[PDB]
Design an enzyme around this catalytic site. Structure first.
Site, short mmCIF file in Angstrom:
data_model
loop_
_atom_site.label_atom_id
_atom_site.label_comp_id
_atom_site.label_asym_id
_atom_site.label_seq_id
_atom_site.Cartn_x
_atom_site.Cartn_y
_atom_site.Cartn_z
N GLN A 64 -9.86 3.84 2.10
CA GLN A 64 -10.88 3.93 3.12
C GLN A 64 -10.69 5.11 4.08
O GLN A 64 -11.32 5.15 5.15
CB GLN A 64 -11.06 2.59 3.86
CG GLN A 64 -12.54 2.12 3.91
CD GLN A 64 -13.17 1.89 2.50
OE1 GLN A 64 -14.25 2.42 2.19
NE2 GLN A 64 -12.49 1.09 1.66
N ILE A 70 -0.17 9.75 8.95
CA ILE A 70 0.78 8.62 8.92
C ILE A 70 0.58 7.68 7.72
O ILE A 70 1.40 6.81 7.47
CB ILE A 70 0.80 7.80 10.24
CG1 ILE A 70 -0.61 7.43 10.67
CG2 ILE A 70 1.54 8.57 11.33
CD1 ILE A 70 -0.70 6.40 11.73
N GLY A 71 -0.52 7.85 6.99
CA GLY A 71 -0.70 7.12 5.74
C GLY A 71 -2.15 7.20 5.30
O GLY A 71 -3.01 7.78 6.00
N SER A 72 -2.43 6.63 4.13
CA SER A 72 -3.81 6.53 3.65
C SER A 72 -4.08 5.23 2.93
O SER A 72 -3.15 4.56 2.46
CB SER A 72 -4.22 7.74 2.78
OG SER A 72 -3.18 8.13 1.90
N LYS A 101 -8.94 7.65 12.32
CA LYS A 101 -9.23 7.40 10.92
C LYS A 101 -10.51 8.11 10.63
O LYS A 101 -11.50 7.93 11.35
CB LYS A 101 -9.38 5.89 10.68
CG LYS A 101 -9.76 5.50 9.26
CD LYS A 101 -9.96 4.00 9.20
CE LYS A 101 -10.09 3.53 7.78
NZ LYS A 101 -10.37 2.07 7.82
N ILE A 141 -8.12 8.86 5.41
CA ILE A 141 -6.82 9.34 5.90
C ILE A 141 -6.69 8.97 7.36
O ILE A 141 -7.69 8.95 8.08
CB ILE A 141 -6.69 10.87 5.71
CG1 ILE A 141 -6.93 11.21 4.23
CG2 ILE A 141 -5.32 11.38 6.21
CD1 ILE A 141 -7.42 12.61 3.97
N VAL A 142 -5.46 8.64 7.77
CA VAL A 142 -5.15 8.21 9.13
C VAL A 142 -4.16 9.17 9.81
O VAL A 142 -3.04 9.39 9.31
CB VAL A 142 -4.61 6.75 9.15
CG1 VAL A 142 -4.24 6.31 10.55
CG2 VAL A 142 -5.63 5.76 8.51
N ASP A 159 -6.28 -11.28 2.90
CA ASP A 159 -5.37 -10.29 2.36
C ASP A 159 -4.25 -9.88 3.31
O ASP A 159 -3.93 -8.70 3.44
CB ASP A 159 -6.14 -9.05 1.92
CG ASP A 159 -5.34 -8.15 0.99
OD1 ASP A 159 -4.51 -8.66 0.18
OD2 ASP A 159 -5.53 -6.93 1.09
C1 G1W Z 1 2.20 3.93 7.67
O1 G1W Z 1 1.42 3.77 8.90
C2 G1W Z 1 1.18 2.52 9.38
O2 G1W Z 1 1.74 1.56 8.87
C3 G1W Z 1 0.22 2.32 10.51
C4 G1W Z 1 0.74 2.00 11.73
C5 G1W Z 1 2.23 1.88 11.95
C6 G1W Z 1 2.79 3.23 12.39
C7 G1W Z 1 3.58 4.00 11.53
C8 G1W Z 1 4.10 5.23 11.95
C9 G1W Z 1 3.83 5.72 13.23
S1 G1W Z 1 4.49 7.30 13.76
O3 G1W Z 1 4.84 7.85 12.48
O4 G1W Z 1 3.53 7.93 14.61
C10 G1W Z 1 6.00 6.85 14.70
C11 G1W Z 1 5.70 6.92 16.22
O5 G1W Z 1 6.87 7.42 16.92
C12 G1W Z 1 3.04 4.94 14.09
C13 G1W Z 1 2.53 3.71 13.67
C14 G1W Z 1 -0.13 1.79 12.83
O6 G1W Z 1 0.29 1.47 13.92
C15 G1W Z 1 -1.57 1.94 12.62
C16 G1W Z 1 -2.44 1.81 13.70
C17 G1W Z 1 -3.78 1.99 13.49
C18 G1W Z 1 -4.27 2.33 12.23
F1 G1W Z 1 -5.60 2.48 12.08
C19 G1W Z 1 -3.42 2.49 11.13
C20 G1W Z 1 -2.05 2.29 11.32
N1 G1W Z 1 -1.14 2.43 10.29
C21 G1W Z 1 -1.63 2.70 8.99
C22 G1W Z 1 -1.67 1.67 8.05
C23 G1W Z 1 -2.15 1.91 6.76
C24 G1W Z 1 -2.58 3.19 6.44
C25 G1W Z 1 -2.55 4.22 7.38
C26 G1W Z 1 -2.05 3.98 8.66
#
Ligand code: G1W
Lengths: 9, 322
Positions: free
Chosen positions: B30, B25-27, B48, B32-33, B144
């Site tokens: 620190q 879902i992103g990085s 994470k 990969i998540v 921040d």
């Molecule tokens: C970009 O990610 C975030 O902003 C983020 C979210 C929001 C999010 C986005 C997409 C989904 S999904 O894609 O599972 C949609 C569900 O139906 C769920 C939650 C979270 O809720 C979140 C929770 C915990 C975490 F440790 C990181 C998270 N991050 C995140 C932020 C920066 C880097 C990596 C991850």
């Protein structure tokens, strides 16, 4: 007021 | 046997079998998540995987501090720790640390440009300030805060993502090289509240020097007493910058942008977006502001609060996992 229970994603 | 591996890009995630359907879902720098379903808890979670935790002493100290703080902070408006584990069976093999946290639905990036009403705006802000207050009570000043590290769910609840330390949201104390206090975080709430309202970034400075220009253009050159508190070098610049009188808050945020409430919204902003920290409203006084206070609940907005070798850091982190 009542607390919002929805937020459009 | 309690573990299984899934390849996520170039990264191998070896996790407990309870965690299912991992997708990235992103990085950050620190690690990969992944989002995952926890079968045991019957809910979605974030996993994470820590990036090179004892590669060096800087990394090690960071991983350690993150872990310990996560074990001590507990509040509905802050992302909580659900689990910590490693798939390695001893200290000698020990390589990877996994951190399992609550998962939300989105960060603020999008939400804030989709114009909201006063109820949703004020309520999100209320939740932000409860989370912040709780961090401060645990002796943590974020510094921040920005929409990329503030997450929301489709039921309108909100959580701050991490413990902090885009240049757009940092307080003047931080931009310049001043000291800071608790209300440094209030500057960021002002920039975020400001954005939600005007539809775009308040101070979109293209670099650290332009960032400053953006602020004084719109708020007006700070007082000579503020000018003193600065260093020799930077004071020179700041004080030699052309005088701006700045704009009133009525011009900075006119009625056209709002769906009595508009008037209070503006008043709060004028107290948050104040260059001189010694005159900027505090977190407590902002939770009590008429615009925010409508949601109050003392159970939410009041809740009670050296050097090592790499080999030593590894041991302390391993113990913190066990
Ligand atoms: C970009 O990610 C975030 O902003 C983020 C979210 C929001 C999010 C986005 C997409 C989904 S999904 O894609 O599972 C949609 C569900 O139906 C769920 C939650 C979270 O809720 C979140 C929770 C915990 C975490 F440790 C990181 C998270 N991050 C995140 C932020 C920066 C880097 C990596 C991850």
């Amino acid at each position: 007021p009542k607390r919002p229970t929805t937020l459009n994603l | 046997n309690n573990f299984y591996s899934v390849e996520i890009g170039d990264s191998t995630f070896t996790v407990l079998k309870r965690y299912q359907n991992l997708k990235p879902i992103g990085s950050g720098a620190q690690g990969i998540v992944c989002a995952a379903y926890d079968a045991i808890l019957e809910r979605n979670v974030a996993i994470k995987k820590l990036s090179r935790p004892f590669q060096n002493q800087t990394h090690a100290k960071r991983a350690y501090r993150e872990l310990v703080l996560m074990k001590c902070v507990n509040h509905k408006n802050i992302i909580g720790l659900l689990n910590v584990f490693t798939p390695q069976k001893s200290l000698e093999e020990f390589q990877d640390v996994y951190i399992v946290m609550e998962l939300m639905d989105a960060n603020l990036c999008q939400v804030i440009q989709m114009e909201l009403d006063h109820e949703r705006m004020s309520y999100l802000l209320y939740q932000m300030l409860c989370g912040i207050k709780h961090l401060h009570s645990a002796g943590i000043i974020h510094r921040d805060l920005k929409p990329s590290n503030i997450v929301v769910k489709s039921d309108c609840t909100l959580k701050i993502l991490d413990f902090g330390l885009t240049r757009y949201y940092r307080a003047p104390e931080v931009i310049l090289g001043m000291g800071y206090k608790e209300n440094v975080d209030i500057w960021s709430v002002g920039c975020i509240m400001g954005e939600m309202i005007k539809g775009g970034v308040l101070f979109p400075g293209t670099d650290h020097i332009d960032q400053w220009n953006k602020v004084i253009e719109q708020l007006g050159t700070p007082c000579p007493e503020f000018m003193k508190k600065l260093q020799p070098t930077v004071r020179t610049y700041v004080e030699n910058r052309p005088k701006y009188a700045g704009y009133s808050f009525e011009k900075l945020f006119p009625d056209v942008l709002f769906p009595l409430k508009a008037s209070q919204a503006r008043d709060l902003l004028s107290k948050m977006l104040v260059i001189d920290a010694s005159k900027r409203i505090s977190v407590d006084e902002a939770l009590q502001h008429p615009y925010i206070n409508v949601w109050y609940d003392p159970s939410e907005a009041e809740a009670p609060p050296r050097e090592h070798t790499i080999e030593e850091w590894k041991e302390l982190i391993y113990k913190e996992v066990m």
